[PDB]
């Protein structure tokens with residue numbers, strides 16, 4: 001696993017997120033659920049908890065964007081870069097953006113929103129790309145029919161626990 | 174009425190539109206509806222026709238945005254600037270952006286999407302602001318329009334027709 005330079009990380013255990021805009025690709029409730037599910041992945045293996053805001057600045061601002069969108073890194077059209085997220089800190093830090101020139105889906109027929117969301121929130125929490133091919137934090141996406149049996153890899157757990165530790169409610173093997 | 178300088182206007186009657194993203198404030202069908210109704214206002218009194226695209230570059234790219242969003246004219250938080258649109262042309266020209274720091278509504282409890290969209294498309298089609306207080310293109314239309322009895326004023330019709338003519342075989 002790998003972190004960003006200086007290992008920036010949230011100094012709070014409860015983070016807020018806000019879904020700022022919605023893609024034409026899915027019904028609004030489907031976007032919400034993949035985001036909820038994506039956050040739940042990280043919540044299960046650390047002390048971190050998450051609540052949603054319907055207004056104001058949330059730690060993790062989530063949006064869909066096409067090409068130039070007000071930050072330093074314009075998206076790039078269909079394919080290639082799928083999304084990007086910023087390491088922990090104030091403002092644009094912690095936020096995640098999703099390229100709408102991608103067809104976001106609830107299954108693997110397009111680009112699975114849950115999977116990309118879980119991988120991006122991984123950056124939002126301070127994990128950089130993993131070299132481990134089995135990790136969620138691996139820089140390359142792959143269509144995996146298996147969304148019902150999704151499991152964080154041990155490399156991921158290790159990387160996120162090195163930052164925040166395990167859940168206070170769980171035993172350690 | 175008024176047109177932009179050098180009177181930029183579409184050189185074709187079939188214009189495509191695309192709703193690039195959706196606001197949290199309303200159900201997506203409410204957005205589609207209001208956008209369609211805004212387009213209809215103008216199509217009804219000209220030879221212009223519209224069709225929707227879900228991919229690629231449409232003439233009129235519609236989006237919601239907050240603060241800095243990829244153009245040189247950032248939105249300003251709640252109220253004041255509700256939205257902005259570019260006159261006819263290629264690329265960003267003809268596109269319309271809507272400030273999501275406003276609360277877009279179907280009715281008048283927030284900022285009415287239909288109304289603002291109708292004004293902005295007026296700009297996307299080549300109309301600049303009117304000096305007539307009753308016109309949709311009057312700068313203060315959003316504070317002066319009665320949505321129950323909404324109809325395009327004749328100053329708005331005179332202006333859009335000056336550019337594109339009346340509907341075929343009137």
Ligand SMILES: COC(=O)[C@@H](NC(=O)CNC(=O)[C@H](CS)NCc1ccc(-c2ccccc2)cc1)C(C)C
Pocket residue numbers: 079080081082083084085115116117119120134135136137138139140141142144
């Ligand atoms: C083969 O896939 C790709 O290379 C795709 N592009 C990328 O992956 C480039 N990466 C990106 O644009 C962003 C940069 S933060 N990475 C998002 C991302 C999201 C999820 C996973 C993932 C990992 C393991 C299991 C399941 C999914 C991996 C990467 C597209 C060409 C389809």
Ligand SMILES: [Ca+2]
Pocket residue numbers: 058059060061089090091092093094095
């Ligand atoms: Ca942030």
Ligand SMILES: [Ca+2]
Pocket residue numbers: 075076077078079080081082099101102
């Ligand atoms: Ca892309």
Ligand SMILES: [Ca+2]
Pocket residue numbers: 023024025099100101102103104
């Ligand atoms: Ca899309």
Ligand SMILES: [Ca+2]
Pocket residue numbers: 231232233234262263264265266267268
């Ligand atoms: Ca355009």
Ligand SMILES: [Ca+2]
Pocket residue numbers: 248249250251252253254255272274275
């Ligand atoms: Ca505003």
Ligand SMILES: [Ca+2]
Pocket residue numbers: 196197198272273274275276277
């Ligand atoms: Ca809003």
Ligand SMILES: [Zn+2]
Pocket residue numbers: 065069071073084097
């Ligand atoms: Zn971005």
Ligand SMILES: [Zn+2]
Pocket residue numbers: 119120123129139
């Ligand atoms: Zn990544």
Ligand SMILES: [Zn+2]
Pocket residue numbers: 242244246257270
């Ligand atoms: Zn703009």
Ligand SMILES: [Zn+2]
Pocket residue numbers: 292296302310312
């Ligand atoms: Zn105006």
